[model samples]
Target: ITGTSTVGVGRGVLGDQKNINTTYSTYYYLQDNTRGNGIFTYDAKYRTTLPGSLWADADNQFFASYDAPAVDAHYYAGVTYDYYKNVHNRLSYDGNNAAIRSSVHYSQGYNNAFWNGSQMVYGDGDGQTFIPLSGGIDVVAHELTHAVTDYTAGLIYQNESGAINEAISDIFGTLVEFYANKNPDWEIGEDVYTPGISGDSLRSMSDPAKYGDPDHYSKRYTGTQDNGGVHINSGIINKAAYLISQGGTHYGVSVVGIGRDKLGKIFYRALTQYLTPTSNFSQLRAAAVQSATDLYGSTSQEVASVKQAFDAVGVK
Candidate 1:
């Protein structure tokens, strides 16, 4: 649960259907003219692609669209909800059984998904090489982790801080996937891609070099697409966490050491408890390493690995 929730009290507004509905517009921009009014309507789609989506308002599948976008989003939201509450003892987004709200068909041919401050929005995908971004558990955790990051560090989304923000999400996102699959073997997005595509996923947590991209920070990051490629450049930190926690030999040579399987949890704790809006890489690295020491021990191998993992990518 979040600090905002007291056993039975909600800090902000709730039960205001009008306010919730109003926030939907602020969450997603207009996708298609289906609603006829430039504004995106929540219930405009009469024929939902997934079962029980028509009444998604009461259920978790709260949206409409063709293909698996609708149901997939439903599954993702519910899974994230369950993941945090069941495994992490978190309620909803804010840990108080927070009223989870979502909107589908965000943009006509939109190929991505995003978590607004209050809710989430999904796109129909390009339909040629991708289906819908919601069908994957990792994406759900990614978006939800965004909410967590927003609540925590509120990283600046640039340079070092941005890398940390994206890193934390990727780290937890992959954990959420692993937690769901009950597999220790590393795998990123094995089931979300469209059959039309050749690659296994948009990013690789186990091996960043698989994409033939740099596994460390660099100055040649600007000229690329994807918002300085926050998601792409994030690979550096993602791989760092993977190698650290999973005890991998890639990205360099093997350094035999003990590790905390709680790597993701410790980062989550640090992000939610310590990191702040103005935090940068150096500051975050210090905070995380300290967190590891606190959770493990100052001289514990896990703590050393925590520092080394970030150092592996030059975060120190």
Candidate 2:
């Protein structure tokens, strides 16, 4: 939709009122022209079709319950975009200012969200397992990081590579959650997961085993499920990343905390410069160590901590 760039007031999934960048033609469309190429959000009409009609508002105000998911999907996309540009100096997901697109309310009582190769799709949950997933900044950032990985490392979506792929998303997603400065913690999808339940998250980066995920390579799930335990095995890498940022001793291996900024820099460099499609856990350790060395020098504590973190997770 062609129109003047504008800002509209809207209440999001969590009932927080905020301003969203929209385009105003005949009606306000959830097309934000302020970032990169653009960030466009659409209504899925509780159906499977993608990017369904650009969300339209007659008054440039979105407060209806039906509009909640679109508002967050549009608003959170901008926040994640800003995080990349400001912190990593990256453009969009493709590093080419590619327009970001999202579709919300994907299906009735749906309980998941995903990146469909071309765009991000979020589901309105069953009101028990989750609410609109876009309510969680980590959830949105995690899905979008898949886009970033797709364009950069192109990590295979199976086995160790797939687990690495998932951990990357969780790592960056948690970073973005911190970047946004909300009640930040080392947890994933805590904000929108399990409305009836309290004080729980989809996964815990600080302690993946809280959800039965392995925190050590020796404990990794090797079964023929979840695409070779892609989601389950990610706990190993996630724990290593947590140790890299927030140092702790694990199985007698100890790491010195390098802090979040340095951790992000090291990982981002590795993902873009060193990682590959078939890279395994051992290879990822090498990449992180090399990336730390590249950023903070071979003799720097950052490099040492990267080595120690992997060792702590039994990646050797």
Candidate 3:
């Protein structure tokens, strides 16, 4: 919708006050036009229907508990957008300044959030399992990067390809979180997951096996569950990415850290330039090697670290 760009004051799930970009036509709406086409958020009203309503407010202020999720959703989408534009020189998820859309409070007791191929949907959580998911910048970025993946690599969502796709989201998600510079860490979803628990997260890129996911290719799950263990198998790739950025020894293989900027550069290049729909672990190694080579030359430390990271994870 058409409206003058505006800012609204709101408190997110963690009770932190922040300003959100909104739009005001007749009523204040969670439609921000400051970036790209816009970042639009909606209220799902505990239904499955998409984007049930463009969240509107009688006042330009959002402070109700019911408004917390939308506040973060809209705010973080802009942060993710800024990350892509500033760090990667990408316009939007589609690299063409596509409008970002998200829905929150999707269903009662729904404990998960997903990209759903078309738009982002976040659940309210059952109170114990999760808080409003959008509160986690990494979670928000993770979902949005799915859009980036869909537009670029078009990686098929199954088996190894699906795992690669998942790790790509995680990789960029953490990068975006760091870019935002707010209590960033290597953990995923710690801010929104298990509010009762103090230090647990949904997954750990630093140590995936902390949650029973494989950290090495040889330990991969070949099970039928989780769409051929897309979530589970992604652990292997996630460990590789973490190693590339932070550097450590895994299974006796050591990698010299090349840092996050180079890590993001190499992986972004791989995702956009080399990865394909059916890419397996071996193929991913090749793509990362080629990507690192393209950016830093075949004999550069960056290229060597990419190879070492994959080898440390037993990807070869």
Candidate 4:
């Protein structure tokens, strides 16, 4: 939808007020032409159908409760876009300034969000479990990072590879949150995970075992469920990433934090240059080690920290 770019004020699912980029033609549409090729948001209207309608509002101001999800989805996509562009020097998900798309209010009480290979789809949770998932920046970034992984590593979404895929999303999602500097923590989906429950998240990178997720590779699930325990096993890699960014002692092993920027650089380089679709835990460890060595010599503490982080997680 080509039109004049404008700003709209709205509150997100978490009641945080922010301005969103919108376009106006005959009616105001949730489209912004300022970033990449463009950013477009749609309303799913609680239906299973994808990409629903190209969200149109009477005015540019979006304040209705129903409009909250779209606002956050649109705004957060922009922020994630800026994260890749500014921090990683990558444009859009493909590094080619591709247009980004999102759909909100997908299926009543859907309680989930995902990237369908082309665009992002967010659910309005069952209210008790979650509100609108787009309200959480980490959630939004996590989904978008899937697209990034698809374009870069093309990591297969099954078995150990699948766990790596999920971990990449979680790692970068947390990085995007830290990049935004908005109450950032090494927790995944904490903001909108459980509205009824407090101080808990769907997953924790800092301490995966806090929610029964494995912080070490020895505890990784070997089940056939969840695409070979993609979500469950991801905790191992997530813990390594957390340790790389924030040093910690775990299970009698310790890691010296190399900080977030270097951590991101190593991971991004590995994801884009070293990893393959079927890469597993051992392969990921090698990739991260090589990435750190490439960025800051094998003799550098950054490289040493990367190795220690994986060792601390029992990946070696």
Give residue 289's lDDT in candidate 4 (0 to 100): 90
Tens digit of per-residue lDDT, candidate 3, span 13-131 = 98989999888999999998889999999999999999789999989899999999999999999999999999999999999999899999998999999998889999999989998
Candidate 3 clashes between residue pairs 3 or more apart in a chain or in different chains = none
Tens digit of per-residue lDDT, candidate 2, span 1-316: 7899999999999999999999999999999998999999999999998879999999999999999999999999999999999999999999999999999999899999999999999999999999999999999999999999999999999999999999999999999999999789999999999999999998998999999999998998988899999999999999999999999999888899989999899999999999999999999999998899888899999999999999999898
Better of 3 and 4 by lDDT: 3
**Model 2 compared with the native: what TM-score?**
0.99
Off by over 4 Å in 1: 1-67, 182-188, 218-225, 250-260
Clashing pairs in 1: 31-107
Tell me the lDDT of candidate 3. Answer: 0.94
Worst 10-residue lDDT window, candidate 4: 6-15
**lDDT tens digits by residue: candidate 1, 64-177:** 234245444444465566667666677665655655545666656666767767666766566755555666677767877888777657887775567677778777777777
Candidate 2 residue 197 Cα shift, in angstroms, is 1.2
Q: Put down candidate 4 lDDT per residue, 42-97, tens digits, no spaces.
A: 99898988889999999787888999999999999999999999999999999999
Estimate the Cα RMSD of every predicted model relative to the unseen true structure.
Answer: 10.1, 0.6, 0.7, 0.8
TM-score of each: 0.74, 0.99, 0.99, 0.99
Best by lDDT: 2
With candidate 4 superimposed using the best TM-score fit, by how many Å does residue 138's alpha carbon deviate from the native?
0.3
Candidate 4 TM-score versus the reference: 0.99
Q: Which regions of candidate 3 deviate over 4 angstroms?
A: none
Q: Quantify all predictions' global Cα lDDT against the true fold.
A: 0.58, 0.95, 0.94, 0.93
Sort by TM-score, best first: 2, 3, 4, 1
